[PDB]
Design a protein around this ligand. Sequence first.
Ligand SMILES: Nc1nc2c(ncn2[C@@H]2O[C@H](COP(=O)(O)OP(=O)(O)O)[C@@H](O)[C@H]2O)c(=O)[nH]1
Ligand SMILES: *C/C=C(\C)CC/C=C(\C)CCC=C(C)C
Ligand SMILES: OC[C@H]1O[C@@H](O)[C@H](O)[C@@H](O)[C@@H]1O
Ligand SMILES: [Mg+2]
Lengths: 187, 178
Amino acid sequence: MAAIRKKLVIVGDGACGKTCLLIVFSKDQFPEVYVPTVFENYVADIEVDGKQVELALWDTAGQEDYDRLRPLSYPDTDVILMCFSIDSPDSLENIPEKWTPEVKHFCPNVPIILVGNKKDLRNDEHTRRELAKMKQEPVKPEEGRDMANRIGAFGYMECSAKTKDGVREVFEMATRAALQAKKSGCL
Amino acid sequence: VNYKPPAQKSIQEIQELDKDDESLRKYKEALLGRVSADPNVPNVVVTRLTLVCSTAPGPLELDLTGDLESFKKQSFVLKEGVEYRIKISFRVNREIVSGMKYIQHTYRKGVKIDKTDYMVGSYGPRAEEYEFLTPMEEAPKGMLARGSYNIKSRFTDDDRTDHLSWEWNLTIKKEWKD
Ligand SMILES: Nc1nc2c(ncn2[C@@H]2O[C@H](COP(=O)(O)OP(=O)(O)O)[C@@H](O)[C@H]2O)c(=O)[nH]1
Ligand SMILES: *C/C=C(\C)CC/C=C(\C)CCC=C(C)C
Ligand SMILES: OC[C@H]1O[C@@H](O)[C@H](O)[C@@H](O)[C@@H]1O
Ligand SMILES: [Mg+2]
């Protein structure tokens, strides 16, 4: 009985809330003072379904400037956190347009968890007021869930890193997807 | 889908970008190196192609460093119904390989009967040799599956380079060589 090691990579649009999500789950504290562009590789102990798991957390740089560098983290990935922001419908649009194409390309069979970050801003009035000027509104849970089945993800989850709500349930589902795999070869 | 390949960028260009972002400087340092080498060598050099099998009497190997013509002059036996992985051993020297993958067309008397491809992935340059294992797969069996096959193997990447192309022969018997 030795701890299982699984690799988790998190991708998604820039400033959509990736790094903060990682820091919160890792250190049980939302960083209000300073937030790195990319978070150092943290290994987080986590137990799911009676299984001890060492979860290696890999942050990425979602900028287009690193479209060539970012894929270096992809090999040996066991589960991936594809993220968008609830307060940015534009970020959701990139899920089937930019991120699903990349992940499925570099990580052919790695299970995908579609995550909706900053869900605390869904019923935030300031956010809605600003989004109204673009004929836009916060993403609905239905919209997220729809996209998840569309990209063939293992499951849809939403959380708020700022309130720490939903974070746990995400990384638990992520770990579950990582902990599992007809016939293949050259028939 | 479909996926558009990354824009061309040397490693030097990458380290220059956001030069004073410590979190991003560590990130690059994490993925890239701490690399020097002969500029006259290919950026990518696939060295071997090893068969990894529990049932196999011993590991079988495709040396891709020599005269690739020799593999037409010989065959490789594979016991039917065994499950195996493929170990790809390659080296990266100067620049990033973007999404290197392994294309394998399996012909039989000029007839394409199978097409398999594995995404090896993206790798930066380093001294230590790289290594990629395919997930566990199993060879076929039956009187049809048994026989001799003609294989065209190829290594490419997202920049449509052909790092290596060669053909070889595979024979599927009831038992191993010995
Ligand atoms: N309201 C809200 N804001 C957040 C949440 N998570 C992150 N943020 C803020 O949004 C920005 C996201 O930064 P970061 O996580 O580093 O983005 P990324 O790493 O580039 O994806 C930061 O300025 C955070 O303060 C959240 O759950 N709710
Ligand atoms: C039908 C496709 C066949 C099974 C591919 C067989 C060969 C491996 C791939 C590589 C190693 C082959 C040994 C060195 C003999
Ligand atoms: O083997 C990798 C090779 O890929 C080609 O596209 C480049 O022109 C070479 O500089 C490089 O060495
Ligand atoms: Mg960040």
